[model samples]
Target: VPRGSMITQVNQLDELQLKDLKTLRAECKKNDGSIPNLYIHILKQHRSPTSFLYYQNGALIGFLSIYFFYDDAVEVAVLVSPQYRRQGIAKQLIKEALPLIKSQNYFNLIFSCPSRLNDNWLTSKGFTYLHSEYFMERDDLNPILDYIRPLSFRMATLEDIPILCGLDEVCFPDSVHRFQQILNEREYEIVIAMLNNHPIGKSHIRWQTKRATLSDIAILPKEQGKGFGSALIAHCINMILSEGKSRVDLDVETHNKKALNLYIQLGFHIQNACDYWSINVNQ
Candidate 1:
């Protein structure tokens, strides 16, 4: 536990070390649900060079992972084992991690945390407020949107990747293109809603251990209000239920009132609000 002995970076983690880090995350999930998803996103991508760990007397105390989106921007994910917090371990781990991220030559670093107990500490650490995203979920607790009645929906194939990626770009300009990575790691399903063979809307289901995620539901701007989005989501719910998953979750930007209202209308509730922060490192 000396001042100069902290360990950092991904290659430093062996398989057992990574398992310990994962165990640390599962422990965190009891206090907050968001950690498991973030943990999975970081680990499953094999996002090396962007990952770091802090050790004291050869024991893991904290860890972080980051992914560079462009030369100018990066997204960071982090966790500190509960036993080591409030003693400045999180700050030290971040200090070590950020320089490594900067060595990747990014000018900005982005991070997100749910709108809950940890915001004050994160803000104190110079992570500036960026925006918030609404976490939405559906299960037997939510009913299908009444507006959706008759619709054509079918499973998507590898051939649908291009269209799905294009739709993702349109929906989330700031997000990284994760199509290949998601396809590689998830027990995934894609559902496309078509009108006369034209792609009007689509839904994606990415399954994990306890739940499945509904991602990238998109309808053309011209086709927004006609119930296509709801229909696509409903279709995904049926698919997830059939898979024996307990719940479905997705994120939407807080400013997107139309999408927010639609999800709310479909029996989905705002489980939490996630605030994003960015550090313009060069500035």
Candidate 2:
């Protein structure tokens, strides 16, 4: 542990503590210039079991959050005050938090690093580089309009949740719980694809200011070759355009050439790249 620094597990934060954490997060962002998204996970009222705060002489200097996925996997994100870097503050926080994170019996500990420096740090700490993703976006809808195929598309209803769950389970088993939660949230718009009264594909968009994220587009394995995926993506793009949004973005695994080609064909271009790292705690 760093000399006078104190690391403590915190299940929740009060108003003042939350303010301090956000302040530290901003400082980290200013210094790193590549911190992905901030405060979104912790802003929710539900308290995670593996949050940590670092302090020196009673001043908050760092924060670490471990978010658990439905499949019992965990993702770790950390922010340290600029002045506190290189002092082993982040290392101590991880060393202390890993046991608690592992105690949850998670399948693995995951990390997504936006910068090469952070990626190298994680790799040096024994985290295995899984794969990177291209954060791609499409600003204009003109190109995609020509690709829009006439398909039965409609907003998902409560009756559609079960089928959506099944599709996501098969396509994105790791995020099935997240998809279920989003289905219940009013802010998310889930679109279902139907072929002769049977659900064949599903996609969803989470709206943000002037932009939206297109995610979890999946087709039943048996229906893959029939161009359902492209149709689903086109429908999603049109939906976002109808809402007057400027652009739509989605992440694709670097090696997913088929999906990458599809997005490029639809006028999407890479905006940024990030690497995903994982560590098997049992090892």
Candidate 3:
């Protein structure tokens, strides 16, 4: 709170505000090109203003977005205009975010900080380092290559959500009811591999302004080590390339050598590492 300054909160941004956000990202660029993914949140089915914007002398000087991509934690991303740095704007934004995150029964507020700047500020604020994921990337494919599809898959639809839910829960601990959160995204597609008229493997492909991402590669426990997961991802990559999208990215836990090598074998290289830090809610 400063003289000639104001703070406003909105459940979500309109189309123009979103466009403005793109420029604002450039205004306060990060080393790893990381910023809050405000666009995806705006596409939520029950979207509300989870963003706070600060203005000084009628100019936007700070922005913060809270993302509820997990079951019980909210991820925070904040930016302060270069000229406005060291002004406690981030702290002010967190003050606003706390009440909202707590009201929703979330247990933690996590920040996915790029490793380059993972700092003492986090510990000073009572946050603990949780885990880190290396952002793996690949691009510029040889579009002329040809290969036979090893598995059969069909695009997922609303009717198959429950099935996806069961499969996701079996393969991942934090994936309960996850597909529903992403079904509304326009370019987000969940693809399922089936055998004998039953779903056995799944992956979600998302096209974005910058690049595409493949996420949630899961296979039935009984189907593990049968090459199902690899085929499922290779199929998604081919499809993305066929559609003229050259880049795809995904994450792997830094300590998980096997998974990291799997993605490396798929032509992905380490781009950056992001460390997650958490602060408790209602403590």
Most TM-score-accurate candidate? 2
Ranking by TM-score: 2, 1, 3
Q: How close is candidate 3 to the true structure, as a TM-score?
A: 0.66
Candidate 1 residue-wise lDDT, 1-283, digit = tens: 5864576666445677777787777666555655622545446455446667777766676777776655678777677777777888766667777678667767787876656647786678677877667778776644353555456787766667777766666665522246555555548777778866777777777788768878666787887777778778877776677767778788666543455877776677766566677877753
lDDT string, candidate 2, 49-70, tens digits: 5678889987899878787754
Candidate scoring better on TM-score of 2 and 3: 2
Q: Work out how many backbone clashes candidate 1 has.
A: 0
Off by over 4 Å in 1: 1-12, 36-50, 56-59, 82-84, 118-150, 157-169, 173-187, 195-198, 207-212, 242-274
Candidate closer to the true structure by lDDT (higher is better), 2 or 3: 2
Query: Which pairs, if any, clash in model 2?
Result: none
Q: Put down candidate 3 lDDT per residue, 1-283, tens digits, no spaces.
A: 4788888888776666565666677664453444433445553334756888888876777888888888978888777777777889888988888888878988788886766464677788788887766767888585323333456789998778777888877876534345666777788999999876888988888888767888777889898777777777777787888777768887555433456666767778876666778888753
Off by over 4 Å in 3: 1-4, 14-17, 30-32, 39-49, 67-73, 100-107, 119-124, 130-137, 143-166, 174-200, 206-213, 219-231, 243-245, 249-258, 269-274
Cα lDDT computed for each candidate against the true fold: 0.69, 0.74, 0.73
Model with the higher lDDT, candidate 1 or 3: 3
- Supply the TM-score for candidate 1: 0.69
TM-score to true structure, per model: 0.69, 0.70, 0.66
Q: List the candidates ranked by lDDT, beginning with the highest.
A: 2, 3, 1
Among these predicted structures, which one has the highest lDDT? 2
Measured with C-alpha atoms, the lDDT of residue 260 in candidate 1 is 82
